[PDB]
Write a protein that binds this ligand. Structure first.
Ligand code: CLA
Ligand code: CLA
Ligand code: CLA
Ligand code: CLA
Ligand code: CLA
Ligand code: CLA
Ligand code: CLA
Ligand SMILES: CCCCCCCCCCCCCCCCCC(=O)OC[C@H](CO[C@@H]1O[C@H](CO)[C@H](O)[C@H](O)[C@H]1O)OC(=O)CCCCCCCCCCCCCCCCC
Ligand SMILES: CCCCCCCCCCCCCCCC(=O)OC[C@H](COP(=O)(O)OC[C@@H](O)CO)OC(=O)CCCCCCCCCCCCCCC
Ligand SMILES: CC1=C(/C=C/C(C)=C/C=C/C(C)=C/C=C/C=C(C)/C=C/C=C(C)/C=C/C2=C(C)CCCC2(C)C)C(C)(C)CCC1
Ligand SMILES: CC1=C(C/C=C(\C)CCC[C@H](C)CCC[C@H](C)CCCC(C)C)C(=O)c2ccccc2C1=O
Ligand code: SF4
Lengths: 73, 73, 741, 63, 80, 143, 165, 41
C-alpha cells in the first residue's frame, strides 16, 4: 500500500511540476502564441482564433497546477 | 500531529506552486535573452520541449500504472 | 387533391463509395483530414442534416430514414431483452414464486473471476438481478413461457429488419417529397387515431382476451402450465365465459349499448390488486378502451382532403388577443418549415411525459409484483426522470437552434415569438429573481436548520416540531383525492393511488404502496425541486431568447448556435453561445434530478417501503425522512453516508460490480473536471511539446494532433460529468435497494 | 533572379512562424523589391487553418 | 483603451476590417512599403477586444494584434 | 465628400417596442443614431431583438451601443445592400459622425486616410518586457 | 525471507484465505441440488480457486501477514531468490510487445509519409501494408538498435520549436 | 466491393476489429491459463 501511494505521490509531484514547468517555459511564447511575453503573465486568452486559446497564459498553467497540487497533498 | 502535518504540507504545496509561478513571472517580466546568452538558463528554454515531454512521460506512466494496479486490486 | 403520397423514385444510388469517403456529407469535411479536429467534426456534424444541405426535402428524407434506423435499433434492443428473458432468465421460475425470486435475465461468463456476479437470485438460477421490470411487464401481458418470449424476440428482429429496409427504401428507392412531410394535419390525424387510438384499442383487445384471463388464473394460484394458452381463450368462448360471464353474451352488449354487461372485465375499481400490488388489469383494459375511443375521435379533428375538419393554420391565426398582437400568426409556417422547432416542442413534452410516467408508475404500480420489487420501482422512476430531464434540455437546445438558424423576422412580425424576443429582458429578469428567491427560501432554510442544529437550537429549526412549514395545499389535494370515490368519483370503488391516503397494500409481507405523508421536509424539498427547475429553465430560456442577439453581442446569430465565444473583449464573452446555455442547463438538470431521485429514494425507503413483520410496518430506513431531511447534514449522514454501506461493502458479492462502477463513475466524474476547469490553450502547447518528441523519433503523424475545441472541451466535460454522477447514483441506488429491498 | 524557384522546396527560418524549420514548396517570389516576396505553400496547415504564408529572403533557405 | 497594432506582414487582404464589429480598422494606401494597401487602426478607443480581426488575419504570425488594455464603457461593450 | 450633418427630422422604422433599447446610458453619457435610405418598406431584424419595418426613404434608428449600430449596418449592407451611416449622439446635443468617416467604407481605400498604429516591424521583432520595464504605466513591448 | 515475507506455501494466513474463499463458495453451493447448472458453475469455481492457490504457492511467491502474494520488483533480489517471473521477466515480456506496437506504428507512419495524401492513409488504414509491417516487426529490437546506430532513428534539428527556442 | 473493403479499412472499423481480436486473445488466454499472477510456466 505504501508502494502504491508513494507512486501516486510521485505522479502528483511530477504532474504538478509538469504543469508548472510547462507554464514557466512556455511563458515567453509557444507555437500557438509566440508573442505571449508581450501579453504579460496573466491575461484572459488570445481569442477563439487559431483553434481556441482558452487558458493559454502562464497564470492559467499555475491555476491548473493548483488543482493538481491540492490533489497531490 | 495530524493538524501540524497537514498544515505544513498544504502550506508547502502552495509555496511550491508559487515558486514556479514567480519563475514564470521572471521569464516574462525580468528575463533578458541577450544578457543570458548561452548560459544554463537559456539552455533550459532551448530544450524545454524535451523537459516537458519527459515530465509528460513520467506523469503518464505513473498515472497509467498506479491507477491500473489500484483498479486491478 | 392536396393530401397525397408524393415521392421521388430512386433519388440516391445505393453504393458503398461514400462509406469509403468519410465526411462526404460536408463540403468542409470532404477535403480530408489535416488535423484531428476533422476527426471530431466528422462525428459532431454527422446528423446535423440542416448543415449538410439547405433544402428541406433532403433534410426531411434523411430525418425520416434515420428515424427508421432508430426504430430498427430499438427493435433489436427489445428483441434482445425478450431473448435474454427466454434464454438467460429465471422467468418461468419467477412466475411460480414472484415474491421470493429475484428477476434476472443476464448471465455472466466465468472468465476472469466475474462469475461472482452470477448471484443467487432464485429459481435454481445464477445471474444478474435485473431492475428493468420486464418480468412484471411480461406477466401483465400474460406470457407464462419462454417460448413466447423467444418468438417475440424473433418478431422483433423481423421488425428491425423491416425498419432498416424501410429506411433504405424511403431514402434510396422511393423517398417522400417535401409536400408529403408538410401534411401535418394528416400526420396528426393518423398518429392520434391510428398510432395511439388503434394502438390502445389493440392493446385493450390483448388485455380483454389474453392478459386479463391469464392473470386472473395466475392470481387464483393456478400454475402457469395449467393455464390455457391465449389462443385457447381466443377460440373457446366458453373458457372466457367461465372466467368472465359477460363473454357468454358476446359482442352484442357492445353494439346494443348494454356496456354495463362488460363490468366484469371493464371495471373502475381503482387502487391496487391485493394479490399482486399492481393495478387491476380490468381497470387497465377499460382505460385503454376509453383512451382508444378518445384518440380515435381526436384523430378526426384536422382537415386533410375533405371539407370536414380543422386547418391548424386557421386555429392559430384566429387565436390572438389585445395583449399578444397578431398572436399565433406565422407559427404554422415555423412548425411546417423548421424541424428543430418541432423537435423542441416534442422533446419538451416527451421529457415532461417521461417524468410524469415516473411519478405515475410508482404511485399507481401498473404491473403485478412491481410495487414490492423495490429495485425495479426505484430504477424505473430514476430512469424515466433522467430521460425526461435530458429530453427537456434537448428541447431547449433545439429551440435555440431554431432561433439561430430557421428563424426569420419577416414571417414573425408582432406575433408571439417576436413579442417574446421583444420583452426577453423582463422574462429573464423575473426568472432570475424567482430563482434567487427560491434558492434563498429553499436552501437557506436548510442552512438555517443546519446552523440551528449545530448551535444547539432545534426549537428554532424549520421542522415538523419547531417551525412547521406544512404543505397544506398538497395535503388538501391528497385528502380530496382520497375522498373522491365518496363524492366526486362515485363510480370508482377506490382512489387512484394509496398515496392519497387509506390503508397499505402488503404483498409478500412487503409494502406495495402506502399513504405518503407530506410534512415540513417535503415542503422544503419540493421547493428545492421548484428552485432547481426554475434555474434550469432560466439557463435554457436565456439561451433561446438570447440566441440571436444580446445587449453584449448584437450579432450572435451570425456567430452561430455553437461557437465558443466572441473573444476576451467586452470583459469576456465566454459561453455566450446558446450551445453553452445548453451546456450549463445540463449541469443544472443533473443537480435538479439528482435531488428529485434522492427525495424519491429516501421518502420511499422511510415512509412507504418496508416489511410487515407483526401487525405494524417496519420501514427500511425507519421513518427518518421527517426529522432528518431538514438539514444538509441529514441528507449527507442519514441518506448518503448511511445508504452507501451497501455499495462500498459489496466487494465479494454479486453486487461487487456496483461498487466497481461506483468507484469508476466517481473517477469519470472527477475526470470531467480536467475538461471543465481547463482550456484549450494549455493543452495545445502541451500537445506541441509532445509532438516535438514524436518529430524527434520520426513518429509525428500526418493528421496533426490538436487539442479539443473549446466547445468540444465543454461537451466532453459535461458528458463525463453527467456519466460519472448518474452512474454513481445508479450503482449506489441499485446496490442499496437490491440488498435492503 | 532573386528567391528560390517556383517549385523549389524551402525551409523556413522565421521563429514566430508555425512552420519554423519546416519544409514548404515555393509558389511565387515577387521580383518587386517588397518585404516578404517568397510565397511558400505548406502541406500541413497552421492553427488558423492556413497552408501558405509570405516569407522574406532572409527567412527562407534552400531544401 | 485596448492597443491594436498592425505589423509589416500585412498583405492588404482587408479581412480584418471586414470582420471588425466596431469599425476600429481601415485600409490605408502605401504606408507599409508593400503592395497597394495596408491596414490601420485609427479608432482603437472603440475597440472592445473581440479579436475577430486577428481571427480573420491569414498571415503567420498575425499582422494585426490586439493587446487588451484598460477597460472603459466602450471597451467593455456596455449599453448601460 | 464632407461630413454629413444628422437630420433629426428623419422618420423611424415601424417597431412595436422592445426592452432591449436605450437605458440610462443614453441619458448620461452617449447613445448612437444610424440613418439609411431604403428603396422599399422591408422587414429587418433589430439588434435589440425583434422585427421592424424600415420605411421607404430615409430611416433613423437609436441605439445605445456602437456594436448594435454596426451590426444593423452589416445586416442592411449584406441582406439589403443599403448604405447606412451612423453617428454618436451625446445628451449635450453634440453629434459625431462615425462610421464612413472618410465617406467610403473602411474595407475599401479612399486615398487620403492616414495610417495609425502601424508598427513597421514584424510581430516577432518586439523587444522583451525587460526593456519596457518601469515605463510609468504598465506597458506591453508593442507600445 | 526477503523483507520479512514468508513463502505462501508456509504461511498460515494464505491457507486461511484459501479455506475462507472455499467456504464462501460451498455456502453458495449448499443452496442448489447435486448437478445443477449453478452447482456445476460453483464446483468449477472451487476447482479454479484451489488450482490458483496451489499454483501461486508452487510459484515460490512470498506472502505477508495477510497471506497475500507480494511481488519483488528488484532485479538482484528477484534473481537471487528465484522471483524473476514476478516483475523482472514480464518486464521484458511487456517491453518486447510495446516496442513491437510502437515500431510497427512508426514504420507505418514512415511508409505512408511518401504518399500524396498521407492523412487519408491514417484514417483509412492500408491493411496489407499494416499487416506486412506487423508481421515483420517481430525483430523490432534488432532493427531499432541498427536504426539507432545509423543515426536514422532520430531527426536532427529540423523539428519545429517555439520562438524562445 | 473495393469501396466496402475501403470502409472496413477505416480507423473505427479497423480499431473495432483489432481490439475485438486483442480482447478475444486475452480472454481465451485467461480462460485456458486462468489467474496468471506470475510467469512460472
Ligand atoms: C513570499 C511570498 C510571496 C510574495 C511576496 C508574492 C508576491 C507577489 N505575487 Mg506571488 N505567489 C505566492 C507567494 C508570494 N507572492 C504563492 C505562495 C503563490 C501560490 C499560491 C503565488 C502565486 C502568484 C500568482 C499566480 C501571481 C502572483 C502575483 C504576485 C504579485 C502581486 C499579487 C497581488 O496583487 O496580490 C493580490 C492578492 C490577493 C488580493 C489575494 C487573493 C485572495 C487569496 C486567494 C486568499 C483568499 C483567502 C480567503 C480570504 C480565505 C477565506 C476563508 C474564510 C471564508 C473562512 C506579487 C509580486 C501575481 C503577479 O505578479 O502578476 C504578474 C500573479 O499573477 N503570485
Ligand atoms: C480523476 C480526475 C483526473 C484524472 C484521471 C486526470 C488525468 C490526467 N491529468 Mg489531470 N486534471 C484534473 C483531473 C484529473 N486529471 C483536474 C480536475 C484538473 C484541473 C483542470 C486537471 C489538470 C491537469 C493538467 C493541467 C495536466 C493534467 C494532466 C493529466 C494527465 C497526467 C498523466 C497521467 O496520469 O496519465 C494517466 C492517465 C489517466 C489516469 C487517465 C486515463 C485513464 C485510463 C488509464 C485510460 C483508459 C480508460 C478506458 C480504457 C477508456 C475507455 C473509453 C471508451 C471505450 C469508453 C492525465 C490524463 C497532465 C497531462 O495531460 O500531461 C500528461 C497536465 O499537464 N491534468
Ligand atoms: C440491446 C441489445 C443486446 C445487448 C446489449 C446484448 C448483450 C449481451 N448478449 Mg444478447 N442478444 C441480443 C441483443 C442484445 N444482447 C439479440 C437481439 C439476440 C438475438 C440475435 C441476442 C442473442 C444472444 C445470445 C445467443 C447470447 C447473447 C449474449 C450476450 C452477452 C455477451 C455478448 C457478447 O459477448 O458479444 C460478443 C460480440 C462480439 C464478438 C463482437 C451480453 C450480455 C451471450 C450470453 O449472455 O451468454 C451467457 C449469448 O450466448 N445474446
Ligand atoms: C448496405 C446498404 C446501404 C448502402 C450501401 C447505403 C449507402 C448510402 N447511404 Mg443509405 N441507408 C441504408 C442502407 C444503405 N445505405 C439504410 C438501411 C438506411 C436506414 C437507416 C439508410 C439511410 C440513409 C440516410 C438517411 C442517408 C444515407 C446515406 C447514404 C450514403 C452514405 C452513407 C455513409 O456514409 O455510410 C456510412 C455510415 C455508417 C456505416 C453509419 C451506420 C449507422 C447505423 C445505421 C446505426 C448504428 C448505430 C450503432 C448501433 C451505435 C453503436 C454505438 C457504439 C458505442 C456501440 C450512401 C449513398 C446518406 C447520404 O447522404 O446519401 C447521399 C444519408 O443522408 N442512407
Ligand atoms: C395509421 C397510420 C400511421 C401510423 C401507425 C404511424 C406510425 C408512426 N409514424 Mg407516422 N405518418 C403517417 C401515418 C401513420 N404513422 C402519415 C399518414 C404520414 C404522412 C403525413 C406520416 C408521417 C410520419 C413521419 C414524417 C414520421 C412518422 C413516424 C412514425 C413512427 C413514430 C415512432 C413511434 O411512435 O413508434 C411506434 C412504433 C410502432 C408502433 C411500431 C410499428 C410500426 C409500423 C410497422 C408502421 C406503421 C404503419 C405504417 C405507417 C403504414 C405503412 C405500412 C408499411 C408496411 C407500408 C410511428 C411508427 C416517425 C418515425 O419514426 O418514422 C419512422 C417520423 O419521422 N410518420
Ligand atoms: C383490436 C382489438 C380487438 C380485437 C382484435 C378483438 C377480437 C375479438 N374479440 Mg374482442 N374486444 C375488444 C377488442 C378487440 N377484440 C374490446 C375493446 C372489447 C370491449 C368492448 C372487446 C370485447 C369482446 C367480447 C365481449 C367478446 C370479444 C370477442 C372477440 C372475438 C370475436 C370477434 C368478433 O365476433 O368480431 C367479428 C370480427 C370479424 C368478423 C373480423 C374477422 C375478419 C377476418 C379476419 C377477415 C379475413 C378474411 C380473409 C380476407 C380471407 C381468408 C384468408 C386466407 C385463409 C385465404 C375476437 C377474437 C368475442 C369472443 O368470442 O371472444 C373469445 C366476445 O365474446 N371481444
Ligand atoms: C429526439 C432527440 C434528439 C434528436 C433527434 C437530436 C438531433 C440533433 N441534435 Mg440534439 N439533443 C438532444 C436530443 C436530440 N438531438 C438532447 C436530449 C440533448 C441534450 C443532451 C441535445 C443536445 C444537443 C446539442 C447541445 C446539440 C445538438 C445537436 C443536434 C444535431 C446533431 C447532433 C449530432 O451530430 O450528434 C451526433 C452524435 C454524437 C456526436 C454522439 C454523442 C455521444 C454522447 C455525447 C455520449 C453519450 C453516449 C452514451 C449515452 C454514454 C455511454 C457511452 C459509453 C461508450 C461510455 C441533430 C439535429 C447539435 C447541433 O444541432 O449542432 C448545430 C448541438 O450542438 N443537440
Ligand atoms: C405578507 C407576509 C406575511 C408573512 C407572515 C408570516 O409568515 O408569519 C409567520 C409566523 C409563524 O410563526 C411560527 O409558526 C410556526 C408554525 O409551526 C411555529 O410553530 C410558531 O407558531 C411560530 O414560530 O406567524 C406569526 O407568528 C405572526 C402572525 C401574524 C402574521 C403577520 C402578517 C403581516 C401582514 C402581511 C400582509 C400585509
Ligand atoms: C400564468 C399567468 C398568466 C397571466 C395571464 O393571465 O396572461 C394572459 C394574457 C392573455 O393575453 P391575450 O388574451 O392577448 O392572448 C391571446 C392568446 O391567443 C395568445 O396570443 O397573456 C398575456 O398578457 C401575456 C403573458 C403575460 C405573462 C405574465 C406572467 C406573470
Ligand atoms: C410485443 C412486440 C411484438 C409483437 C407485438 C404484437 C403481436 C402486436 C399486435 C398488434 C395487433 C394484433 C393489432 C391489431 C389491431 C386491430 C385493430 C386495431 C382493429 C380495429 C377494429 C376497428 C377499429 C373496428 C372498427 C369498426 C367497427 C368497430 C365495427 C365494424 C365497422 C368498423 C370496421 C369501422 C413484436 C413481435 C413486434 C416484437 C416487439 C414487441
Ligand atoms: C485533457 C484535455 C485535452 C486533451 C485531450 C486530447 C486532445 C484528446 C485525447 C483523445 C484520445 C486519447 C486520442 C485519440 C487517439 C486515437 C484515436 C486512439 C487510437 C489508439 C489508442 C489505442 C491509443 C484538451 O484538448 C482540452 C481542450 C479544451 C478544454 C479542455 C481540454 C482537456 O481537459
Ligand atoms: S472561450 Fe477562450 S477566447 Fe473566448 S473568452 Fe473564454 S478564454 Fe477567451
Amino acid at each position: 500500500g505504501d508502494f502504491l501511494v508513494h507512486h501516486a505521490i510521485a505522479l502528483g509531484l511530477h504532474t504538478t511540476t509538469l504543469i508548472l514547468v510547462k507554464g514557466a517555459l512556455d511563458a515567453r511564447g509557444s507555437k500557438l502564441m509566440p508573442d505571449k511575453k508581450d501579453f504579460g503573465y496573466s491575461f484572459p486568452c488570445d481569442g477563439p482564433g487559431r483553434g481556441g486559446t482558452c487558458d493559454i497564459s502562464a497564470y492559467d498553467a499555475f491555476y491548473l497546477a493548483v488543482f493538481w497540487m491540492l490533489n497531490t497533498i | 500531529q495530524a493538524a501540524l502535518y497537514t498544515h505544513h504540507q498544504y502550506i508547502a504545496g502552495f509555496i511550491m506552486c508559487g515558486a514556479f509561478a514567480h519563475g514564470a513571472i521572471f521569464f516574462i517580466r525580468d528575463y533578458d535573452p541577450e544578457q543570458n546568452k548561452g548560459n544554463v538558463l537559456a539552455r533550459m528554454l532551448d530544450h524545454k520541449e524535451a523537459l516537458i515531454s519527459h515530465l509528460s512521460w513520467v506523469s503518464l506512466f505513473l498515472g497509467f500504472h498506479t491507477l491500473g494496479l489500484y483498479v486491478h486490486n | 387533391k392536396k393530401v397525397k403520397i408524393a415521392v421521388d423514385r430512386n433519388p440516391v444510388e445505393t453504393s458503398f463509395e461514400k462509406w469509403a469517403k468519410p465526411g462526404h456529407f460536408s463540403r468542409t469535411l470532404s477535403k480530408g483530414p489535416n488535423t484531428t479536429t476533422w476527426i471530431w467534426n466528422l462525428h459532431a456534424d454527422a446528423h446535423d442534416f440542416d448543415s449538410h444541405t439547405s433544402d428541406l426535402e433532403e433534410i426531411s428524407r434523411k430525418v425520416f430514414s434515420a428515424h427508421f434506423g432508430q426504430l430498427g435499433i430499438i427493435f433489436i434492443w427489445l428483441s434482445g431483452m425478450y431473448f435474454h428473458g427466454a434464454r438467460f432468465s429465471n422467468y418461468e421460475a419467477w412466475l411460480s414464486d414472484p415474491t421470493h425470486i429475484k428477476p434476472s435475465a443476464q448471465v455472466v461468463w466465468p472468465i476472469v473471476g466475474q462469475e461472482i456476479l452470477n448471484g443467487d437470485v432464485g429459481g435454481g438460477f445464477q445471474g444478474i438481478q435485473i431492475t428493468s421490470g420486464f418480468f412484471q411487464l411480461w406477466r401483465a401481458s400474460g406470457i407464462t413461457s419462454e417460448l413466447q418470449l423467444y418468438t417475440t424476440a424473433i418478431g422483433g428482429l423481423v421488425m428491425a429488419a423491416a425498419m432498416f429496409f424501410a429506411g433504405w427504401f424511403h431514402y434510396h428507392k422511393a423517398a417522400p417529397k417535401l409536400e408529403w412531410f408538410q401534411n401535418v394535419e394528416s400526420m396528426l390525424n393518423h398518429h392520434l387515431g391510428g398510432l395511439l387510438g388503434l394502438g390502445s384499442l389493440a392493446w385493450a383487445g390483448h388485455q380483454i382476451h389474453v392478459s386479463l384471463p391469464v392473470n386472473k388464473l395466475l392470481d387464483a394460484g393456478v400454475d402457469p402450465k395449467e393455464i390455457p394458452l391465449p389462443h385457447d381463450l381466443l377460440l373457446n368462448r366458453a373458457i372466457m365465459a367461465d372466467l368472465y360471464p359477460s363473454f357468454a353474451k358476446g359482442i352484442a352488449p357492445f353494439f346494443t349499448l348494454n356496456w354495463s354487461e362488460y363490468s366484469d372485465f371493464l371495471t373502475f375499481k381503482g387502487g391496487l390488486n391485493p394479490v399482486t400490488g399492481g393495478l387491476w388489469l380490468s381497470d387497465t383494459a377499460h382505460h385503454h378502451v376509453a383512451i382508444a375511443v378518445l384518440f380515435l375521435v381526436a384523430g378526426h379533428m384536422y382537415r386533410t382532403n375533405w371539407g370536414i375538419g380543422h386547418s391548424m393554420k386557421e386555429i392559430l391565426e384566429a387565436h390572438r388577443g389585445p395583449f399578444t398582437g397578431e398572436g399565433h400568426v406565422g407559427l404554422y409556417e415555423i412548425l411546417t418549415t423548421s424541424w428543430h422547432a418541432q423537435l423542441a416542442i416534442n422533446l419538451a413534452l416527451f421529457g415532461s411525459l417521461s417524468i410524469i410516467v415516473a411519478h405515475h408508475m410508482y404511485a399507481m404500480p401498473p404491473y403485478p409484483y412491481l410495487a414490492t420489487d423495490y429495485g425495479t420501482q426505484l430504477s424505473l422512476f430514476t430512469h424515466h426522470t433522467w430521460i425526461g430531464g435530458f429530453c427537456i434540455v434537448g428541447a431547449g437546445a433545439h429551440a435555440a437552434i431554431f432561433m439561430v438558424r430557421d428563424y426569420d423576422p419577416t414571417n414573425n412580425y408582432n406575433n408571439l415569438l417576436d413579442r417574446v424576443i421583444r420583452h426577453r429582458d423582463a422574462i429573464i429578469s423575473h426568472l432570475n429573481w424567482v430563482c434567487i428567491f427560491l434558492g434563498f427560501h429553499s436552501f437557506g432554510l436548510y442552512i438555517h436548520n443546519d446552523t440551528m442544529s449545530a448551535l444547539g437550537r432545534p426549537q428554532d429549526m424549520f421542522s415538523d416540531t419547531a417551525i412547521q412549514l406544512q404543505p397544506v395545499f398538497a395535503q388538501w389535494i391528497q385528502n380530496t383525492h382520497f375522498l373522491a370515490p365518496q363524492l366526486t368519483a362515485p363510480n370508482a370503488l377506490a382512489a387512484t393511488s394509496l398515496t392519497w391516503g387509506g390503508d397499505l397494500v402488503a404483498v409478500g409481507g412487503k409494502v406495495a404502496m402506502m399513504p405518503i405523508s407530506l410534512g415540513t421536509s417535503d415542503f422544503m424539498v419540493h421547493h428545492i425541486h421548484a428552485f432547481t427547475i426554475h434555474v434550469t429553465v432560466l439557463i435554457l430560456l436565456k439561451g433561446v431568447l438570447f440566441a440571436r442577439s444580446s445587449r453584449l453581442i448584437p450579432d450572435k446569430a451570425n456567430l452561430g448556435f455553437r461557437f465558443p465565444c466572441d473573444g476576451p473583449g467586452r470583459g469576456g464573452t465566454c459561453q455566450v453561445s446558446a450551445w453553452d446555455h445548453v451546456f450549463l442547463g445540463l449541469f443544472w438538470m443533473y443537480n435538479s434530478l439528482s435531488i428529485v431521485i434522492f427525495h424519491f429514494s429516501w421518502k420511499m425507503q422511510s415512509d412507504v417501503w418496508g416489511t410487515v413483520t407483526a401487525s405494524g410496518v417496519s420501514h427500511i430506513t425507519g421513518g427518518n425522512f421527517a426529522q432528518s431531511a431538514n438539514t444538509i447534514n441529514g441528507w449527507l449522514r442519514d441518506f448518503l453516508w448511511a445508504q452507501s454501506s451497501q455499495v462500498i461493502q459489496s466487494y465479494g458479492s454479486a453486487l461487487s460490480a456496483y461498487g466497481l462502477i461506483f468507484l469508476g463513475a466517481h473517477f469519470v466524474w472527477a475526470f470531467s473536471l480536467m475538461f471543465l476547469f481547463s482550456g484549450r490553450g494549455y493543452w495545445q502547447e502541451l500537445i506541441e511539446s509532445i509532438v516535438w518528441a514524436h518529430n524527434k523519433l520520426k513518429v509525428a503523424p500526418a493528421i496533426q494532433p490538436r487539442a479539443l475545441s473549446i466547445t468540444q472541451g465543454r461537451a466532453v466535460g459535461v458528458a463525463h460529468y453527467l456519466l460519472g454522477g448518474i452512474a454513481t447514483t445508479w450503482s449506489f441506488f441499485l446496490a442499496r435497494i437490491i440488498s435492503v429491498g | 533572379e532573386v528567391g528560390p524557384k517556383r517549385g523549389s522546396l524551402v525551409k523556413i527560418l522565421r521563429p514566430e512562424s508555425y512552420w519554423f524549420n519546416q519544409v514548404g514548396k515555393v509558389v511565387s517570389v515577387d521580383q518587386s523589391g517588397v518585404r516578404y516576396p517568397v510565397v511558400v505553400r505548406f502541406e500541413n496547415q497552421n492553427y488558423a487553418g492556413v497552408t501558405t504564408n509570405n516569407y522574406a529572403l532572409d527567412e527562407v533557405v534552400a531544401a | 483603451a485596448h492597443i491594436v497594432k498592425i505589423y509589416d506582414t500585412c498583405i492588404g487582404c482587408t479581412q480584418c476590417v471586414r470582420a471588425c464589429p466596431l469599425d476600429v480598422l481601415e485600409m490605408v494606401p502605401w504606408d507599409g512599403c508593400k503592395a497597394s494597401q495596408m491596414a490601420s487602426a485609427p479608432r482603437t478607443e472603440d475597440c472592445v477586444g473581440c479579436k475577430r480581426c486577428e481571427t480573420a488575419c491569414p498571415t503567420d504570425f498575425l499582422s494585426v494584434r490586439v493587446y487588451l488594455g484598460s477597460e472603459s464603457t466602450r471597451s467593455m461593450g456596455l449599453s448601460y | 465628400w464632407t461630413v454629413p450633418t444628422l437630420n433629426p427630422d428623419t422618420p423611424s422604422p415601424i417597431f412595436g417596442g422592445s426592452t432591449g433599447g436605450l437605458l440610462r446610458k443614453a441619458q448620461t453619457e452617449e447613445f448612437y443614431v444610424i440613418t439609411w435610405e431604403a428603396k422599399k418598406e422591408q422587414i429587418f431584424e433589430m439588434p435589440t431583438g425583434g422585427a421592424a419595418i424600415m420605411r421607404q426613404g430615409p430611416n433613423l434608428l437609436k441605439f445605445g451601443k456602437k456594436e448594435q449600430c454596426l451590426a444593423l449596418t452589416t445586416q442592411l449592407r449584406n441582406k439589403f445592400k443599403l448604405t447606412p451611416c451612423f453617428y454618436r449622439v451625446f445628451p449635450d446635443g453634440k453629434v459625431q459622425y462615425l462610421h464612413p468617416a472618410d465617406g467610403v467604407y473602411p474595407e475599401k481605400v479612399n486615398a487620403g486616410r492616414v495610417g495609425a498604429n502601424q508598427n513597421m516591424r514584424r510581430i516577432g521583432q518586439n523587444v522583451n518586457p525587460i526593456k519596457v520595464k518601469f515605463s510609468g504605466r504598465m506597458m506591453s513591448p508593442a507600445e | 525471507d526477503i523483507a520479512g515475507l514468508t513463502p505462501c506455501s508456509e504461511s498460515k494466513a494464505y491457507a486461511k484465505l484459501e479455506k475462507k474463499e472455499l467456504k464462501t463458495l460451498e455456502k453458495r453451493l449448499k443452496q442448489y441440488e447435486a448437478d445443477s447448472a449453478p452447482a456445476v458453475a460453483l464446483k468449477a469455481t472451487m476447482e479454479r480457486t484451489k488450482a490458483r492457490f496451489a499454483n501461486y504457492a508452487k510459484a515460490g511467491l512470498l506472502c505477508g501477514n495477510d497471506g497475500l502474494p507480494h511481488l519483488i520488483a528488484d532485479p538482484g533480489l528477484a534473481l537471487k531468490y528465484g522471483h524473476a517471473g514476478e516483475v523482472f521477466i514480464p518486464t521484458f515480456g511487456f517491453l518486447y510487445v510495446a516496442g513491437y506496437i510502437g515500431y510497427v506504428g512508426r514504420q507505418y507512419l514512415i511508409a505512408v509519409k511518401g504518399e500524396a495524401k498521407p492523412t487519408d492513409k491514417e484514417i483509412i488504414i492500408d491493411v496489407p501494408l499494416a499487416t506486412k509491417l506487423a508481421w515483420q516487426g517481430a525483430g523490432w529490437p534488432l532493427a531499432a538498435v541498427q536504426e539507432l546506430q545509423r543515426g536514422t532513428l532520430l531527426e536532427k534539428e529540423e523539428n519545429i520549436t517555439v520562438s524562445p527556442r | 466491393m473495393k469501396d466496402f473493403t475501403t470502409y472496413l479499412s477505416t480507423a473505427p472499423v479497423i480499431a473495432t476489429i483489432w481490439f475485438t481480436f486483442t480482447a478475444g486473445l486475452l480472454i481465451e488466454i485467461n480462460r485456458y491459463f486462468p489467474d496468471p499472477l506470475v510467469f512460472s510456466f
